[PDB]
Write an enzyme that holds these catalytic residues in place. Structure first.
Site, short mmCIF file in Angstrom:
data_model
loop_
_atom_site.label_atom_id
_atom_site.label_comp_id
_atom_site.label_asym_id
_atom_site.label_seq_id
_atom_site.Cartn_x
_atom_site.Cartn_y
_atom_site.Cartn_z
CB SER A 5 -41.62 50.99 -78.59
OG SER A 5 -40.21 51.27 -78.49
CD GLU A 41 -38.75 54.35 -75.76
OE1 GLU A 41 -38.82 55.22 -76.64
OE2 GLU A 41 -39.34 53.22 -75.83
CB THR A 81 -37.66 45.42 -78.40
OG1 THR A 81 -38.41 45.01 -79.54
CG2 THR A 81 -36.60 44.35 -78.15
C1 LIG Z 1 -39.28 50.21 -78.37
O1 LIG Z 1 -39.69 49.26 -77.64
N1 LIG Z 1 -38.08 50.59 -78.50
C2 LIG Z 1 -37.69 51.63 -79.48
C3 LIG Z 1 -36.94 50.95 -80.62
N2 LIG Z 1 -37.82 50.10 -81.46
O2 LIG Z 1 -38.23 48.91 -80.90
S1 LIG Z 1 -39.55 48.19 -81.27
O3 LIG Z 1 -39.62 48.06 -82.72
O4 LIG Z 1 -39.56 46.69 -80.76
O5 LIG Z 1 -40.66 48.95 -80.92
C4 LIG Z 1 -35.73 50.18 -80.04
C5 LIG Z 1 -36.01 49.38 -78.76
C6 LIG Z 1 -36.98 49.95 -77.74
C7 LIG Z 1 -36.36 50.78 -76.64
N3 LIG Z 1 -35.50 50.17 -75.83
O6 LIG Z 1 -36.70 51.95 -76.41
#
Ligand SMILES: *C(=O)N1C[C@H](NOS(=O)(=O)O)CC[C@H]1C(N)=O
Length: 268
Positions: A43, A141, A212
């Site tokens: 993200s 995503e 993440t």
């Molecule tokens: C970002 O990496 N994502 C969107 C959401 N928030 O995560 S973050 O706070 O670590 O940015 C959930 C996980 C992830 C995704 N898998 O899209």
């Protein structure tokens, strides 16, 4: 021992690959550890995405209502699921994308930026416009969570993303009024309490955007300010490819890396 040895131990202890970059300043040397190795954005791309949209439009574009359906929600979207019936303005989407890391908000921002087939290339072109020839976004995503370790798609480097963030927050890539919005959203982020923030003393100000993913991926990118207003940029990226697709991310790895950095920046 030196800081590279400290970062190596973090890696051994968490069974992780860690990347760190903090640009040099007048009074501090760059901190660089795997700074040119690639790591999945996850993200974290949503910060420069919001900047792309701010940059390319008047501030009045923030009031444009985007309508969408439950069919458009195919990733974790805490804010977008709540507003699916009434729509969200571009402004609200930028808010959600940064502060809740909202996946549908990011996808709708990608479509606003480059249209339905063009968003990821347009976002990447924004990065190229800032001089970043390294980073790339290829999917949206949640498809971007499937790229395996070693795939160059949907990746940046600690070097690249910190330098982008630096221009955005501390440079002139945005005009002051647009810059302030980015900064406010990152300041009000809800998702980074246990990452870079946790490494810096409470009188340092922190703004951030996390990411993440699968393969134990955990990232955070921040700008921090000393208690006297001295700014620094910190990118910390990690993965735990060792444990396969379902390896658990370790936020404390990032908190620790941040603490090592804060020890360098804060101790005179
Ligand atoms: C970002 O990496 N994502 C969107 C959401 N928030 O995560 S973050 O706070 O670590 O940015 C959930 C996980 C992830 C995704 N898998 O899209």
């Amino acid at each position: 021992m030196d800081l590279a040895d400290r970062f190596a131990e973090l890696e051994r202890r968490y069974d992780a690959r860690l990347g760190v970059y903090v640009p040099a300043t007048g009074t501090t040397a760059a901190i660089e550890y795997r700074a040119d190795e690639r790591f999945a954005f996850c993200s974290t791309f949503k910060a420069p995405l919001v900047a792309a949209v701010l940059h390319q439009n008047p501030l009045t574009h923030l009031d444009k209502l985007i309508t969408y359906t439950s069919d458009d929600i195919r990733s974790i979207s805490p804010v977008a699921q709540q507003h699916v019936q009434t729509g969200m303005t571009i402004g609200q989407l930028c808010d959600a994308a940064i502060r809740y890391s909202d996946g549908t908000a990011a996808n709708l921002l990608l479509a606003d930026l480059g249209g339905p087939g063009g968003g990821t290339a347009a976002f990447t072109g924004y990065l190229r416009s800032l001089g970043d020839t390294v980073s790339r976004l290829d999917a949206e995503e949640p498809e971007l969570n499937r790229d395996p370790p070693g795939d160059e798609r949907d990746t940046t480097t600690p070097h690249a993303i910190a330098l982008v963030l630096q221009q955005l927050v501390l440079g002139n890539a945005l005009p002051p009024d647009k810059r302030a919005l980015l900064t406010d959203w990152m300041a009000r982020n809800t998702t980074g309490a246990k990452r870079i923030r946790a490494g810096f003393p409470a009188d340092w100000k922190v703004i951030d955007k996390t990411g993440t993913g699968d393969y134990g991926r955990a990232n955070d990118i921040a700008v921090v300010w000393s208690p006297t207003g001295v700014p620094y940029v910190v990118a910390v990226m990690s993965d735990r490819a060792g444990g396969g697709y379902d390896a658990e991310p370790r936020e404390a790895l990032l908190a620790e890396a941040a603490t090592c950095v804060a020890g360098v920046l804060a101790l005179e």
